[PDB]
Design an enzyme around this catalytic site. Sequence first.
Site, short mmCIF file in Angstrom:
data_model
loop_
_atom_site.label_atom_id
_atom_site.label_comp_id
_atom_site.label_asym_id
_atom_site.label_seq_id
_atom_site.Cartn_x
_atom_site.Cartn_y
_atom_site.Cartn_z
N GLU A 1 -0.22 7.10 10.92
CA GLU A 1 0.99 6.61 10.29
C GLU A 1 2.07 6.26 11.32
O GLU A 1 2.09 6.77 12.44
CB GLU A 1 1.53 7.65 9.32
CG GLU A 1 2.67 7.15 8.47
CD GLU A 1 2.87 7.97 7.23
OE1 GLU A 1 2.71 9.20 7.31
OE2 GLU A 1 3.21 7.38 6.18
N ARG A 2 2.98 5.38 10.91
CA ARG A 2 4.20 5.13 11.67
C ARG A 2 5.13 6.33 11.60
O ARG A 2 5.39 6.85 10.51
CB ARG A 2 4.91 3.90 11.13
CG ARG A 2 4.13 2.64 11.29
CD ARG A 2 4.88 1.48 10.68
NE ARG A 2 4.02 0.33 10.51
CZ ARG A 2 3.15 0.18 9.51
NH1 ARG A 2 3.24 0.95 8.44
NH2 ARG A 2 2.38 -0.89 9.48
N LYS B 1 0.82 -1.21 0.00
CA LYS B 1 0.00 0.00 0.00
C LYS B 1 0.85 1.26 0.00
O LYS B 1 0.68 2.14 -0.85
CB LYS B 1 -0.90 -0.02 1.23
CG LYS B 1 -1.96 -1.07 1.19
CD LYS B 1 -2.48 -1.36 2.59
CE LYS B 1 -3.03 -0.13 3.25
NZ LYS B 1 -3.11 -0.33 4.72
N1 LIG Z 1 6.80 -3.07 -5.61
C1 LIG Z 1 7.58 -3.61 -4.65
N2 LIG Z 1 8.86 -3.96 -4.88
C2 LIG Z 1 9.62 -4.49 -3.92
N3 LIG Z 1 9.18 -4.74 -2.68
C3 LIG Z 1 7.92 -4.44 -2.32
C4 LIG Z 1 7.03 -3.85 -3.31
N4 LIG Z 1 5.85 -3.65 -2.72
C5 LIG Z 1 5.98 -4.08 -1.45
N5 LIG Z 1 7.20 -4.55 -1.21
C6 LIG Z 1 7.66 -5.10 0.07
O1 LIG Z 1 6.58 -5.31 0.98
C7 LIG Z 1 6.70 -4.39 2.07
C8 LIG Z 1 5.34 -4.04 2.68
O2 LIG Z 1 4.57 -3.09 1.94
P1 LIG Z 1 4.49 -1.58 2.43
O3 LIG Z 1 3.72 -0.78 1.41
O4 LIG Z 1 5.84 -1.15 2.91
O5 LIG Z 1 3.57 -1.70 3.74
P2 LIG Z 1 2.00 -1.82 3.52
O6 LIG Z 1 1.91 -2.59 2.23
O7 LIG Z 1 1.49 -2.54 4.73
O8 LIG Z 1 1.56 -0.39 3.43
C9 LIG Z 1 7.54 -3.28 1.51
O9 LIG Z 1 8.16 -2.61 2.60
C10 LIG Z 1 8.55 -4.11 0.78
O10 LIG Z 1 9.34 -4.81 1.73
MG LIG Z 2 1.24 1.13 5.05
#
Ligand SMILES: Nc1ncnc2c1ncn2[C@@H]1O[C@H](COP(=O)(O)OP(=O)(O)O)[C@@H](O)[C@H]1O
Ligand SMILES: [Mg+2]
Lengths: 173, 83, 460, 113
Positions: free
Chosen positions: C182-183, C156
């Site tokens: 948010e964090r 997300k």
């Molecule tokens: N497009 C991407 N490419 C590489 N890693 C990804 C990608 N999307 C998500 N990730 C991995 O998954 C993690 C979790 O998603 P993130 O957006 O950080 O938290 P959330 O999805 O809960 O908001 C990311 O920090 C990364 O480690």
């Molecule tokens: Mg998030």
Amino acid sequence: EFITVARPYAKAAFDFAVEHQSVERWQDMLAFAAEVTKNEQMAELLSGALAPETLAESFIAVAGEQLDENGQNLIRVMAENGRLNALPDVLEQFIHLRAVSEATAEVDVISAAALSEQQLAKISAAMEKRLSRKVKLNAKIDKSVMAGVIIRAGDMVIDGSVRGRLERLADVL
Amino acid sequence: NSTEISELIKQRIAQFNVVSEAHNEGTIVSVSDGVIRIHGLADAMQGEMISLPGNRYAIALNLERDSVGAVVMGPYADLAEGM
Amino acid sequence: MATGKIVQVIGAVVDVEFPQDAVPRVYDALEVQNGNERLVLEVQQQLGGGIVRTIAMGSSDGLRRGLDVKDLEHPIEVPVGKATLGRIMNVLGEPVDMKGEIGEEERWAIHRAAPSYEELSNSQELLETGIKVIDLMAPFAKGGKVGLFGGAGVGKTVNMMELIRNIAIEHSGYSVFAGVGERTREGNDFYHEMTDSNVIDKVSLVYGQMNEPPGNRLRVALTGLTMAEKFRDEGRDVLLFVDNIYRYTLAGTEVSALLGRMPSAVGYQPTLAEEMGVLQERITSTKTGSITSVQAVYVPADDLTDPSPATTFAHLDATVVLSRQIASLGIYPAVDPLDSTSRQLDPLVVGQEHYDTARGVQSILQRYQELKDIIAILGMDELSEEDKLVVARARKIQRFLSQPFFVAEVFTGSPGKYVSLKDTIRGFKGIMEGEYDHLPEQAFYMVGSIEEAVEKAKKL
Amino acid sequence: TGKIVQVIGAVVDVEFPQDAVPRVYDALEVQNGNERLVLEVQQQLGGGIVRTIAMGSSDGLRRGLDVKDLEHPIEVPVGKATLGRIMNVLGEPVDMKGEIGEEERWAIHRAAP
Ligand SMILES: Nc1ncnc2c1ncn2[C@@H]1O[C@H](COP(=O)(O)OP(=O)(O)O)[C@@H](O)[C@H]1O
Ligand SMILES: [Mg+2]
């Protein structure tokens, strides 16, 4: 709100005062109990968690100028149920109940200025024909009325102010 | 007789020598399962530490009207009313 | 002068008694000295005679019964305007960036009604984004609402940082970022990122982090809207990014029972749908100006059926459903092409070739899904040849949806790719028409345009 | 000294004077008909009332009965005396043999090492 817990005790007192022909004495007795219950130290004794028997003695002793039937029991039974903060409501409940049995209405009238005492006597006899009770007018001089009068008769009211008509016309536009 | 009757009451109350608690002090009125209820203690902040008899403490977590809920930090089977 | 006294303090909820004349009205602010700390209370209910029940906009620790309260006769009012650009603020619109006073010209109340039905303005001015899967499956217009649905860890935030990069830099209008719940680390990382890229001069930031008492997390979303609505009423086109709509509803759940409300179906408050509605119906593009908004939506436990995600689905123009399965398989971004859609995906408003490509892609992937468990039990040899064909083309299509992002470079060690909309259509149509049937699946994985698919195929 | 005020199934509420209310795990004794019943205190409610659990059959108890306040917990025989024998929760002998010849009795609510 204490009105609901007041109602059983107020009805028991009002039902009882007419068995003993002393409504008028009971009313001032309860007005007494309502004035003492407002005291800041007495309210601390009420909030202080004594057991009901010893708290009852600590209240009955302080209000000794009351009959055996009247003071010492009503105050004790309400004290076991912890209802004594209901006493200002028990009072008004009692009064209303009386005004009901005596076929009376404590009509209020409101005006921008004093009425001619012919206007006011006409108001009395007409409200007594509108209702079916002996009315007891009391007036208020509110300058926002500007002209005319408001008659409030308990839950019912009769607006004759010019201000109400002015703001009604402002919405008919 | 409102002013006279309320003086009569004030004098009879004082003459009976019933009296207020001090601010910052109270009394335990119920002990149950490691939770105590204290009457009084008007100048108690939420999260404050209240000293019990002994070196024991309780945390005041709940500030109701006319009561305080505090949690006992340690063994509680030693407490009672009137403390 | 002060006029009320505190009578209860149960957790985060504070009751104040006032004279029975001039009792504070609902949603008013109140002020109390929590020692040296000025504490704001917001009125939530007028209950009983002279009493009001309120929520603390700060820590409730240190309050005593009998403290004096002063009633401000207005809601919480926040700075609005250009003076908010480049500044971090809290829910009360106080600076938290240590750069000094905001210097505002005007202040606005955060509680206001939504636009009237005759004020709303129709638009189909489709935005282009670098992301293949989104622009194929869920394109969205300027002035529309976009929702990113996912459980924990599905992408997300990384998606929202990519969309902020792609959309906001081309956008010349001011933007608002509302960090609801948010964090704190992620808020600092974002602030520094914008500060380095020099785009911080056109973004206003409102941050209410997880550590803050429920009233802050509850009301911080409305301060974000109040700033965006000031820009919209000036007539600007505004970009509003909201970090989680879910933790507004959750901040309502935490305090709801202490407000005396009877619990609802999954323990949510009884007023969940109204609380969502009153907020989300302000986020609209009127005749005077347009707000464009992207919202992330947490999905508790990864079930799309939970009341909170279930209601918010009905407010959004585009809904990009991310899925944990696709993330666990390692395909990124983890968009589910079967669940995600947009109301701008119409043959009338997109190109009719776009629409035909989208219908093809979805039909193929649906046809793969039903085959999956059949192959798993009975084996691939018991397919027929035309199914063996469509299962291959399905795998090639399901690889070509993946993409490297410039903001997801730190995680994977590869450059970031931006694909134009036309190139996306041209590629997926070519794959479905079989012009690339002979290339392996990895020739489509993690690549840009289909010309890059043939370059990498040559290297393969 | 105290009196039973409520009998709700297994729990029994006893009202004591304000100055001698039993501690949080003391034991009380009642004559329930021809039988003696021990009660164990669990909660001190306000006004000198305590909630207790009955260590025996609660049928036959009438409100207004008089309880007797023992000033110690449930104390049971221990050691070499309790070695070939079957005993009750009150530490009474349950085999038909005679009394347990204990030198010492311990309260059952102790602290972990
Ligand atoms: N497009 C991407 N490419 C590489 N890693 C990804 C990608 N999307 C998500 N990730 C991995 O998954 C993690 C979790 O998603 P993130 O957006 O950080 O938290 P959330 O999805 O809960 O908001 C990311 O920090 C990364 O480690
Ligand atoms: Mg998030």
